[model samples]
Target chain A: NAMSRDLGRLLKIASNQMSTRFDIFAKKYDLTGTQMTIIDYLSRNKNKEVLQRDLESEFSIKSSTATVLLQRMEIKKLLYRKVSGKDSRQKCLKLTKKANKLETIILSYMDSDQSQMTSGLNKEEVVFLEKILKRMIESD
Target chain B: RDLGRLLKIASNQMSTRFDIFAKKYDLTGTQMTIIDYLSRNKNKEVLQRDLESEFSIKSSTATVLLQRMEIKKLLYRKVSGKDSRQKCLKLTKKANKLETIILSYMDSDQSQMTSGLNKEEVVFLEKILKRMIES
Candidate 1:
């Protein structure tokens, strides 16, 4: 019970801190943490000719959720959605010129955040942490 | 520079994997989670209060998620006459059918991807992750 309690406390603290940090980072880009993730996902697959459904799948959101997300992004001119010629329900998504232009700026913000998040760790420790996190992610 | 690049690569890899896995069941991870939560507590009203606590989200966020689920035909949202402001949910037959397929698919995918770790490693990793999350 004591160990479990300690673990719970630690998790709660870590979760709260990480959430706060993400909130600040999200504000810097005028996006929510989720919105930033959507942007990053879209940017990474820029060459793949992605779709709203693809985003729904990638981000683990519902089709309707995906639609709303895309609608907002479209309004911002960050991306565009075109009905797929092959499938009516499937809508292709593409990054707008504005989105492309913001890539560097957005990525720099992420880089800065990553550095800040891992500030206390030395090079080797950071590498170890990365490896450990990857292992956990892959394992789960 | 190297650290920056590594983070970018890791992020992309995770995103791509999620995309591929989500498509198999025609459900996104979010959709799956919502459905899974609802199915696990089928007797419950599945109200906004239910989701807000489940997702650790705001009331508005829960409202949005419920609205989206309704739009997708995954559930029907009914206003409780007794409590005018409260909305109840019922999972559709389609949702139930899809839930079985999606859950199995997700399990398979997760198992395959995490095949590299043994039992001890998993326990250790989970423990360390709990620590990381705490820290």
Candidate 2:
């Protein structure tokens, strides 16, 4: 019973700490955790045209929330929106050169942080953790 | 790359799923979660302070959440007979039924979520997660 009670609290605390850590790293670039996530996603799919709707669904956030996030990123010159060739009314999102340059640094930091967090566990344990977490995330 | 980020992503994903499910019952995820907690601890007297520590929510946030739920007739608070200053929390009859339904749904959801892992793996996962939290 105590373990079950601690599970939710632990997950929540871990989430808050993760966000705070990422925010600290991202602050110099005037980026928040959400902004960094968007940039990371865009960088992975640079060849594809990403739209506001794409972001909303990808992050499981509302359109309004995604709109505000994109607006702030746009203002910071980390990303830009252009008219989508497929839809005249819709705008496609693209990362600015600044974002591209920052991507390398962000990726390195992310990798380092992950390694540090899992250093307490063995490789097999890390694999198991990832497997179960992916299951939890993919559960509908 | 960090486990922290993965943990965050999974937690948010679970929250989103619970939110959508809870909305159908006209309850927020946190409200339903608290209701479920009370249902489990029905044999014992639960207090506002107990909930705050259990859920790791701020006192103000818990007070507002409990207040909103009280208004919705999901729960009622009374001054504890044992401790006059402590408010004892109990689910209403309406909440009792809702809690049963929510618990069933949660069980099914949890089963599906851990379907990829065997029973032993789940136990191991919980152990490591606990260790991570403590560390």
Candidate 3:
């Protein structure tokens, strides 16, 4: 019976546990799990001006979900949407003064938190897992 | 070293893709997931509480979820045959019919998910993934 388990379920539950662990960590930061994830992404791409649609595609979230998420983050003043100078028709997403501060704090522990999760596997495996996982997230 | 983050995004993208394909059958992504979960546990005795924990959804949330599925004629709740005041969930004929079609879609998805990997590499990849899941 176990021999026939689906790879999709393994992928789904593995991520579920990772996010659940973060949910606890998310509480102290006064951020939702999604908000924390968005912060991490925004922090990594410091040079680029991220658009609303960029967040939607990056996070694999629907447009409506992205709208509500950005709205809430705006409500909390974690981020804001500014009219793009080059494309006034489009609004670019930007973190507020507060979120930039929070991002620094969270980044300190973020690496270690990720490190611990991969502790059970070998360094080589971790590298390959990242590669394969990226591969899988690509097509669909 | 963004292992955990990558895992979640991969899952999210995969689930979103499933939802997109299942929409043809009038099912949301979560609804499609519930159907898959129930079918997977068909050999076991799964209850309402089982569904709640499996989905990490609250009791009230599961109530509304199952309520909608019931209204959609996708599933029904029947009293447990071996237990008291408990109900065991079962798929409807419509659900079974849809599942057969949906499974073919999932089969193609499984292929596309690992499209770039070599046969040998895919084996090693899933092996490493299993360790992460258990960890």
Candidate 4:
């Protein structure tokens, strides 16, 4: 029971801290964490010309789930999809000009807070923590 | 690149796995978390303010989370005794079944994600993660 209590406290703290960061970020970009995540992935990999199906696999979502998310993003005029010339069946998705414009706006907000949040940690500590966490993820 | 980068990547990975699991069970992980918490603590009063502080969400966000759960027929909320300002949350039978499924899903995800780790490593990892949370 004591261990559970301790664990719950840790979880609550982490959840709240992360939620606060997300809430602030969300308001600035008019995006929830989920929406921002999808947008980030699309924007970053636009140069690679990734397919919609690949995104579904990457996110471990069903085709319909991916479709709905993309459709919503499209409706917001953040991105657009077109049937690929190389394969009639394959759909090509890209960030629209509007999406790129919005992404720049989002990046500005992110950049402003990025350094201040990590001010407590020294460079070495930051690197060590990053390595440990990455190792943990890969170990799994 | 840094702690923030690691957190971002790890979070995305975690969200991807949980999203698939949540979709399979027809609910979001957040919704399931609320149901599971209410089901286990049914005898005790779970106030909206308590959840607001506990979950690190704003009062309005907590309200919306509860509203969504109620619409899903997983749980309901009512005013607490002598504290009209507070809302008491409780899980329904439907939520009980869903909780079982959610637990199973979490277990499966945990096992897969930590397949390289032994039980001892897992115990250690949990400890380290807790420390990180506090830090």
Candidate 5:
């Protein structure tokens, strides 16, 4: 009964609903939800040299998982890797134009879900909800 | 609005933590969570439909997953008293023995997820999450 109150499960179930919605857009682009997410993150952080480890840490993905995912993205021309610097030992990530064009559409999908989920709440409520979500995301 | 993105990241972090915690017992977070559900509703007539509904799974998913639990002898499905076609869920003695550890972990896991929130924030968070889930 208390499973209804489970914060982790609750967040997951709630997020899954959004994933289902996001899947529609992803399928059209021949990409999975995760791929689209990586593209969006890369697009957002073009000013920085993103490492595979940053994505692994940010996405809570395993090292091997991120490697395979990034490899697949490279094959799809969604992203590519370059030498991180003169060290010649590391690689940084970049997004392709194909990936860049997807950001606006992906953001639209995110916007729609946000509006849909918070449709019942007022301005102040939305602010508080955003704050709490940010708090949890930052929490240990 | 990156709210959806925010929720996904938060949920991912929470689930990773759950998996890490469950690994100590050689179980996945999902199996541990299902055991916890069964443990809490001993007196209620739980059905396979209830399992699917509560876990946000389809009937097909329930079949495969419920079968694994059967082979593991964690729980069983018996024909309902009201109808032969209808089956109700019940946990085994072995599962009951594991309930204590599962419950303790769940409490700690839940607390960890809600760590920074005060009483009011926790309540509000629960309310909003429940609303979004319902929507």
Candidate 6:
């Protein structure tokens, strides 16, 4: 009924608002939501090699799209690409000091947005919401 | 970790999927979304401003999007009888014909997305999402 339709609309709206809010904060650092996500992903996988193809798959973006974004991020000094020692043809992606410096701020923005979005719900409701959302995403 | 980030990821993935699905119809995901909204409100008068509010987009953004759709012959606008300055929107026959197919795609996507959850969980999720939206 209306509930199903409303749920989809709310999710899309909340997601769009989150991106807009992040863009507002990220602009100060010359970052976009996509770039910030790349930085975060690289930070988490610092122990292992990450490639351009990895970003394409991880972000569900096309190769050309990933290449352009990576190029832009490289120009911003947010990250750098080096020829992998094990595979010269493959380029390994790494966050630069500049990108690392913005991690805390990016995380804070995420926290602030998440808090604002869930402010309408109680702790238990949030927990349940997260559970259901995880189920939906994982199902996909 | 923030659930908002996860939500953004899921939404982006869904949008990406929808974009690919919409490509065959020569439509963008946003266009498909607008079509869905217009189809649902076929009986009522719709305006560009109403779409702007519904999608949380700016007036300029809505104007450009509507212009593109108009150029594509998906929809057209007319001066409202009640207010000449206000433009009411309606879908073209081309858009109307595409609605059933687009809606099926949306339903299939939604069903796949919620496959992991039981009916009760979906109902609960919808309730919480509605509260969040209204708040």
Interface RMSD of 6: 2.6
Q: Per-residue lDDT of B13-131 in model 6, one digit per residue for the tens?
A: 78888899888999999899899888888777788888888777899999899999999999998887766789899999999999989888887787888876778877777777767
Clashing pairs in 1: A10-B134, A60-B29, A60-B30
Clashing pairs in 2: A114-B2
Report the C-alpha lDDT of model 5 over B5-52, residue by residue, as the tens digit.
677878777777778877886667777788888888777778888878
Chain B TM-score by candidate, in order shown: 0.63, 0.89, 0.74, 0.75, 0.86, 0.87
DockQ of each: 0.07, 0.33, 0.44, 0.20, 0.54, 0.48
Among the numbered candidates, top TM-score falls to 5
- The lDDT values for all models are 0.60, 0.76, 0.78, 0.64, 0.78, 0.79
| Candidate achieving higher DockQ, 5 or 6 | 5
Ten-residue region with minimum lDDT total, candidate 5 chain B? B1-10
lDDT of 4 at A30: 69
Docking class of 1: incorrect
For model 4, state the Cα shift of residue B24 in Å: 2.1
lDDT of 6 by residue, A72-136 (tens): 99999999988787667998998889888988877676566677777789899888877766666
Q: Mark the 10 consecutive residues where model 6 chain A has the least summed lDDT.
A: A1-10
Give per-residue lDDT, candidate 6, residue B73: 99
Off by over 4 Å in 5: A1-4, A47-64, A83-90, A137-139, B24-26, B81-84
The native-contact fractions of the candidates, in order shown, are: 0.09, 0.49, 0.70, 0.22, 0.63, 0.52
CAPRI accuracy category, model 2:
acceptable
The number of the candidate with the highest lDDT is 6
Give the winner by DockQ: 1 or 2: 2
Candidate scoring better on TM-score of 1 and 2: 2
RMSD of 4: 6.4
Poorly placed runs, candidate 4 (over 4 Å) = A1-114, A121-125, A136-140, B81-84, B107-135
Candidate 3 residue lDDT tens string, A1-140 = 32223467677767877788788888898998779888888888768778988887777678998998899989999998888765668998888998999887777657757776776898988988887776676655
lDDT of 6 at B132: 66
Ranking by TM-score: 5, 6, 2, 3, 4, 1
